[PDB]
Design a protein around this ligand. Structure first.
Ligand SMILES: COc1cc(-c2ccc3ncc(-c4cccc([C@@H](O)NCCN(C)C)c4)n3n2)ccc1O
Length: 276
């Protein structure tokens, strides 16, 4: 409730499509008053409760409510919100550098030290979010973007807060959602969820970052899920032959089934691999 009612086209020029999901499309746009470039996320409203072809207003308002709070170098910022008959339109800080892993895939090689420089930025972003009791709940390589890929030290921005939740002290939250490869066993098993689920996903991201292989990815969705639940993974010599003992220890402390024994974001930043 209380989103801008004006025609967004009266205030922005729209450009190329940047990405699209089942119920959303992101496009480049330019604010007319300033000439500054932004991103516009057009979210389809479901409009009727029985419809499966759009997003519930509860979900839309939850994402907007969280984005409104956020101001940090490694997380996307919200500029404006518009609404018309069919869509809610989020005007967001533009991140034009593409996915982190596409950038890395074009490099000649990448040392562990160099890898940890990008990972530290992700850690810094999540540290901010967890400090505000916000769980992202959809951390995966495609939601790790670069602001500008054409600078000496490219900056990471975490995007897509469609699944994000404020962790409420008084009531457990359970749900099954997210991408099988990257979700924690508590999500798979419909158990109580919290900030800890993000740290598991960071462990998966770190594993792929160093090896280019995915730790739990099986030959069917159900097999992937079973791998996750049983924490069935290996540092395959083919992929991890040049990886340090400390890097493996970092990952092992994150890919822990019991959320209460999993390394926290605060502790991950003090781990000797990250803070020598
Ligand atoms: C997709 O959901 C969001 C995207 C963004 C966001 C903000 C600024 C921004 N600049 C560029 C992009 C961008 C560029 C390319 C692709 C995408 C993304 O929508 N692609 C799909 C990501 N995920 C849903 C697989 C997003 N974004 N995306 C922010 C909050 C969101 O909930």
């Amino acid at each position: 409730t209380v989103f801008r009612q004006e025609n967004v086209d009266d205030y922005y020029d729209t450009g190329e499509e940047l990405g699209s999901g089942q119920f959303a499309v992101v496009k480049k746009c330019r604010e007319k008053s300033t000439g500054l470039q932004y991103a516009a996320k057009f979210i389809k409203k479901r409009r009727t409760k029985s419809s499966r072809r759009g997003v519930s207003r509860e979900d839309i308002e939850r994402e907007v409510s969280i984005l409104k709070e956020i101001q940090h170098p490694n997380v996307i910022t919200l500029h404006e919100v518009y609404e018309n008959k069919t869509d809610v339109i989020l005007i967001l800080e533009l991140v034009a550098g593409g996915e982190l892993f596409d950038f890395l895939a074009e490099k000649e090689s990448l040392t562990e030290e160099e890898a940890t420089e990008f990972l530290k930025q992700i850690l810094n972003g999540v540290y901010y979010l967890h400090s505000l009791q916000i769980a992202h709940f959809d951390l995966k390589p495609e939601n790790i973007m670069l602001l500008d890929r054409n600078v000496p030290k490219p900056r990471i921005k975490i995007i897509d807060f469609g699944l994000a939740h404020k962790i409420d002290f008084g009531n457990e939250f359970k749900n099954i959602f997210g991408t099988p490869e990257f979700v924690a066993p508590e999500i798979v098993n419909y158990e109580p969820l919290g900030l800890e689920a993000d740290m598991w996903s960071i462990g998966v991201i770190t594993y792929i970052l160093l090896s280019g292989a995915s730790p739990f990815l099986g030959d069917t969705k159900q097999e992937t899920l079973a791998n996750v639940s049983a924490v069935n993974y290996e540092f395959e010599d083919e992929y991890f032959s040049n990886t340090s003992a400390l890097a493996k220890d970092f990952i092992r402390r994150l890919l822990v089934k019991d959320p209460k024994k999993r390394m926290t974001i605060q502790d991950s930043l003090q781990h000797p691999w990250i803070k020598p």
